[PDB]
Amino acid sequence: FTKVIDEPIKSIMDGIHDGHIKKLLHQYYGDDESKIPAVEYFGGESPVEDSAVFKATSSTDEESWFKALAGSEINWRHASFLCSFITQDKMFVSNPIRKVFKPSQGMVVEISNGNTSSKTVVTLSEPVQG
Amino acid sequence: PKLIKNKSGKIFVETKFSKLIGRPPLLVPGMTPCTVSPDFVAATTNAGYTIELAGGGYFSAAGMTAAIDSVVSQIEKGSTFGINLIYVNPFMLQWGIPLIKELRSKGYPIQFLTIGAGVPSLEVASEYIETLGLKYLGLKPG
């Protein structure tokens, strides 16, 4: 399959990917791109309620806590609470959102407008001065 | 296998590997001397496909650091790439694994480490997985 010379790797890889896409579209989606499921962003998935209130305790599991905070719908909240790293100027560092929202006793997270990603707000309160 | 489109409408081949890496399930493996060039690694990353910077054309942490800095300078913001290391030469690992750990500690966009020409023992693989702090570990069993 190595015949064409000086074909840029962008072109070669896009050709392979587009071949896979068109064949999958013909076989499992009936030549219809509207049948393709749509998500906000595609990535970060490990191989392994409009108004909500969550309370952290010593015994809660961190993964379940973060999944609950993220929610089901793929959006900026999903990325904030499940993405492991955030991008610096050109570097990768631990997600400040997860480390700030790490569960602990007294932590109460109120999510409002969870259904609407644009208007969603996550207010975290902790015991301050009692 | 399935097709999935992001907000921009870019059709991805939805797969396990693709779902994890947020990119198409097509990668350029570490190739001495082909992927040794920082330019080719950066070009593949800009194209949007996973690529491994091969260490076989590098003999010191300084040379690898220079090449990785070249890759980082040439790629776009948020891009990423992996590093391929050969297991048959212990010197390679001895200078490369501490470098990968240091660069990851610095926050470099090293998505993964691939081990070719041999599979590490359980203890060595655990050491890599824990200390390096990569997204995933590539292994090329024979």
Resolution (A): 2.6
Which contiguous run of DSSP H or E holds residue B46?
Answer: helix B38-47
Structure tokens at A118: 């644009």
For the purposes of burial, counting CB atoms within 10 Å of the CB of A65, is it exposed (0-12), middle (13-18) or buried (19 or more)? Answer: buried
Q: Which residues contact A50 (CB under 8 A, 6 or more apart)?
A: A112, A113, A114, A115, A116
Rounded to whole angstroms, how far apart are CA atoms B79 and A98? 21
Give CA–CA dist A90/B138, Å, rounded.
Answer: 23
Residues of B in contact with A37 (CB under 8 A): 2-5
Q: Which residues contact A129 (CB under 8 A, 6 or more apart)?
A: none
Which of B10, B11, B71, B137 should we substitute to test contact with A (largest number of A Cβ atoms within 10 Å)? B11
Cβ-Cβ contacts under 8 Å between A and B: the total is 100
CA nearest to B22, candidates B135, B126, B106, B100: B135
Residues B49, A13: C-beta atoms closer than 8 Å = yes
CA of B104: which chain A residue's CA is closest? Answer: A92
Q: Alpha-carbon torsion B81, A76, A18, A23, what sign?
A: positive
Pairing relationship of beta strands A108-112 and A52-55 according to DSSP bridges: antiparallel
Residue in A1, A20, A41, A87 to test binding to B, most B beta-carbons within 10 Å: A20
CB-based contact, B20 to chain A, within 8 Å:
yes
Structure-determination technique: cryo-EM
Pick from A125, A75, A79, A120: which is nearest to A100 by CA? A125
Nearest-CA residue of chain A relative to B45? A10
Residue of B nearest to A29 (CA): B3
Q: After which residues is chain B broken (C to N over 2.5 A)?
A: none
How far does A109 lie from chain B, in Å, by closest CA? 28
Q: How far apart are CA B95 and CA B117, in angstroms?
A: 17
**What's the token pair of residue B3?**
């097709």
